Amino acid sequence: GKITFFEDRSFQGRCYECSSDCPNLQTYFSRCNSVRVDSGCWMLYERPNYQGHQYFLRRGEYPDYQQWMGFSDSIRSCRLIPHAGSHRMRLYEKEDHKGVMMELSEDCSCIQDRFHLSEVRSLQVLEGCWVLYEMPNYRGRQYLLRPQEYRRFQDWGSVDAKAGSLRRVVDLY
Template identity: 55%
Template structure:
């Protein structure tokens, strides 16, 4: 696996002070005051629970819906293989269930129950959003069992 790199810029159009990061960084505040632009050279990154893939993001305030305060970053693990997750309407994997193997922009259109209280991530890493079409707060789920919403 090659080197993974993300670069943060303080000013618009990739100008001003910059900070290049190639590993997780729990506190970026000592490297820059604000972040206006991001360039992902390689790897998958999570900023404020958002996954970031290779590319340029010229207006992160509009894209992310946040201000220019980024305080940490996390490398998202690379996954080779299938993706599979089961959601359940009740805690401890009870009640109505549904399995997903690909992105779904609006779960409640397919899973007619509006309560999800437990999840079993069988393969891959998943990002859950509070609102349809990948909006709102996100929850990053690694493979494993989540028996209650609070987990």
């Protein structure tokens, strides 16, 4: 993957290119108002060491922070997310993988329609990386999921169990 951060909107100002993850972008810039992704799938974070708000970005031009549903011009770390050849995950109604369950191997733009619940209280991510969105149609707070089990919402960094949509992390061409 290849990503370039710019201090100002419209690919203007001080800039930094990355090709692998970075635990701390603060050395290189103090604000980020536009991004160009050349290649790969990227999680951006509001804070250093992959904390605070998370933003999912893939190949394309982002002329301002709103384009990636940003909450501020703070961008202080980033992960390059691995492509996976297939995706598979289980959503549970209750913590610790109990209650009703739904299996997912494609993008789901409305959990509520398929599952009949507004919250996912535990997850088993078996294959691929995914982005969980607070809201349907890939809107609201975003949470990067990776292969592992999540016994409760705290394990993915959310404020609560509310979840509207799920996206497979797949590279854009």
